[PDB]
Design a protein around this nucleic acid. Structure first.
Ligand code: CL
Ligand code: MG
Ligand code: MN
Ligand code: NA
Length: 325
DNA sequence: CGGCATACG
DNA sequence: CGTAT
DNA sequence: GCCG
């Protein structure tokens, strides 16, 4: 089992679901406390289990696996022996975990904002509503739409949204294309947001495109909220006899950069962190959603496909469906 | 022990 | 500070 | 929290 998640296939569904979910509770809790190192190790240990070909049934099967030390192994040991891990259950029950989770789920609220509200004594969404002078307009949107945004987006919803986005993109710039990215491109059947990547086959034609797209969507009455290359929107999506608010992210890239942006926006988030870490630490190349830089030659790698990029980095190619780290 | 991904709004 | 993967 |  290699040590980096980008070095191994990770399917969407797997054989250690319970064990990985427990570790990911501890990762999330570490994040709420500002401990990014411990978050990362628990995330990585969870991801290793997702990559295994069968269920872990005994503690000895952890021997030799990367990212499994005293703490993560103990978590698994307790789950194997008793069906529950006391530490994990304590986190789950805690007022701190539950409130930080509730608050950071709001669009516009991060760990630092959640933490300050927690420390001021706030606990509930209605606590926040009763003091709206304390909220940004982004947070106000996030709070008004919180119920709808908490309901999973389905793949049927995605196809309807894609047709709508293509229509506006087509008026804004004939020939521009719309590609589904994010978790749905990895094969997820549900999600909490839809991600699209927009480009045009003629380099440079995409300059200034996103404002033109947003103006057109707004004119069609589709935009409940938005604030450039990236747009984080709340869309009005048709429902039987009504509609619901859906988070949609729109990203534009020049076609020269499209493979990098496609790779970068298709995720998973842990997969991208591990791939960038691998690039820099193992190959000495600097990766982002724009390009891949050799800091010795001071040159950028030209890529025509995601396949090109995996080959550049000396990694076996992984389709999106195997990037669910 | 240092490091932990890398951007844009 | 927030957002994204 | 774990790797190297
Ligand atoms: Cl980036
Ligand atoms: Mg997404
Ligand atoms: Mn998104
Ligand atoms: Na949030």
């Amino acid at each position: 089992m290699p040590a980096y998640a980008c070095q191994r296939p990770t399917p969407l569904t797997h054989h250690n679901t319970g064990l990985s979910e427990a570790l990911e509770i501890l990762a999330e809790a570490a994040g709420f406390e500002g401990s990014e190192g411990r978050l990362l190790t628990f995330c990585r240990a969870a991801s290793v289990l997702k990559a295994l070909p069968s269920p872990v049934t005994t503690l000895s099967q952890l021997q030799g696996l990367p990212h499994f030390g005293e703490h993560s192994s103990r978590v698994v040991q307790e789950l194997l022996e008793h069906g529950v891990c006391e530490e994990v259950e304590r986190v789950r029950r805690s007022e701190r975990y539950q409130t930080m989770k509730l608050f950071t789920q709001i669009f516009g609220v991060g760990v630092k904002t959640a933490d300050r509200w927690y420390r001021e004594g706030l606990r509930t969404l209605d606590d926040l509503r009763e003091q709206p002078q304390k909220l940004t307009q982004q947070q106000k949107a996030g709070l008004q739409h919180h119920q709808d945004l908490s309901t999973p987006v389905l793949r049927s919803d995605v196809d309807a949204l894609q047709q709508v986005v293509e229509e506006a993109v087509g008026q804004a710039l004939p020939g521009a294309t719309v590609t589904l990215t994010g978790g749905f491109r990895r094969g997820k059947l549900q999600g909490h947001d839809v991600d699209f990547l927009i480009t045009h086959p003629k380099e440079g034609q995409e300059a200034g495109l996103l404002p033109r797209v947003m103006c057109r969507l707004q004119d069609q009455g589709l935009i409940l909220y938005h604030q450039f290359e990236r747009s984080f929107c709340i869309f009005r999506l048709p429902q039987p006899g009504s509609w619901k608010a859906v988070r949609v992210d729109l990203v534009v890239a020049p076609v020269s950069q499209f493979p990098f942006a496609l790779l970068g926006w298709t995720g998973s988030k842990l997969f991208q962190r591990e791939l960038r870490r691998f690039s820099r630490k193992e190959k000495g190349l600097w990766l982002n959603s724009h390009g891949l830089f050799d800091p010795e030659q001071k040159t950028f790698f030209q890529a025509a496909s995601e396949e090109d990029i995996f080959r550049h980095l000396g990694l076996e190619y992984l389709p999106p469906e195997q990037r669910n780290a």
